[PDB]
Amino acid sequence: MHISSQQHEKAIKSYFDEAQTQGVIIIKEGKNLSTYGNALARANKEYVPASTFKMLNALIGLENHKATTNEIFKWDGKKRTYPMWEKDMTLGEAMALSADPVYQELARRTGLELMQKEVKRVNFGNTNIGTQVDNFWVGPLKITPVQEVNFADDLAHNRLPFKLETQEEVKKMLLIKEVNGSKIYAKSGWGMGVTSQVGWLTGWVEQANGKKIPFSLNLEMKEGMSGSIRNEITYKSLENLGII
Numbered sequence: 001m002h003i004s005s006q007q008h009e010k011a012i013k014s015y016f017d018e019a020q021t022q023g024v025i026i027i028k029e030g031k032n033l034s035t036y037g038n039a040l041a042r043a044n045k046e047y048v049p050a051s052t053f054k055m056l057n058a059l060i061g062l063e064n065h066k067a068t069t070n071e072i073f074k075w076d077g078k079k080r081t082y083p084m085w086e087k088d089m090t091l092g093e094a095m096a097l098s099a100d101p102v103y104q105e106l107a108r109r110t111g112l113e114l115m116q117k118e119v120k121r122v123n124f125g126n127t128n129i130g131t132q133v134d135n136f137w138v139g140p141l142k143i144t145p146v147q148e149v150n151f152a153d154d155l156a157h158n159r160l161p162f163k164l165e166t167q168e169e170v171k172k173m174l175l176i177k178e179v180n181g182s183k184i185y186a187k188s189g190w191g192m193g194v195t196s197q198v199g200w201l202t203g204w205v206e207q208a209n210g211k212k213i214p215f216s217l218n219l220e221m222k223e224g225m226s227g228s229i230r231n232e233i234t235y236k237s238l239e240n241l242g243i244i
């Protein structure tokens with residue numbers, strides 16, 4: 001395929017421009033990282049992981065037998081931020097809905113001490129979870145888009161320090177799209193910040209031939225933006241690059 005890199009860069013930049021945001025999307029092919037978008041310097045800047053952290057939370061909870069993948073976490077009947085969360089769900093259904101209350105229960109079964117240890121051990125982001133287990137994913141923990149794409153790469157290839165089966169079980173929770181033979185695995189994130197909001201979509205493409213291409217989209221979310229913009233820009237970018 002004969003599109004210039006200049007034209008790729010301009011197309012992907014324009015997807016962020018057209019959404020009235022600032023963002024980057026990092027792509028990893030083998031050992032090589034590529035940075036695209038309209039704010040490239042976001043790539044080695046730190047932001048809260050927000051719900052991208054559900055990936056690690058799940059890994060920790062399963063590895064330490066705080067939950068199983070078929071277990072049903074019951075809605076306790078209290079009003080929840082979103083009505084779609086007002087139902088009983090497995091970790092996998094909760095991942096798909098990004099249901100904080102399930103993931104908070106799981107973090108609390110894991111407990112603050114074991115959670116610090118696991119986060120220090122996996123070297124995730126700046127590895128600081130502080131002293132609130134229920135909610136540290138508002139500071140102190142932060143991570144860069146480069147770190148996130150490298151986390152995705154690890155997970156996709158079963159390199160994190162967890163059992164193979166723990167990693168497969170979590171990967172299975174992350175399937176969000178199939179497109180022309182390709183599978184996209186990823187987790188979204190939307191954090192409320194200092195003065196802005198961060199938007200994430202971190203995962204990988206599994207192509208028919210088996211090659212895995214990790215990515216991490218990171219942009220600033222604004223009032224009146226739908227969450228699915230993160231998806232649209234991701235799919236467009238990966239399509240532009242011929243990854244899907």
Ligand SMILES: *C(=O)[C@@H](NC(=O)/C(=N\OC(C)(C)C(=O)O)c1csc(N)n1)[C@@H]1N=C(C(=O)O)C(=C)CS1
Nearest residue numbers: 048050051052098100137138188189190191192227
């Ligand atoms: C994961 O990212 C979740 N996000 C949050 O709980 C945070 N903020 O979310 C609210 C205030 C609901 C928001 O919509 O901005 C958050 C966590 S740590 C931090 N500093 N802020 C759930 N995930 C998503 C997602 O897209 O994955 C949501 C749409 C909101 S809830």
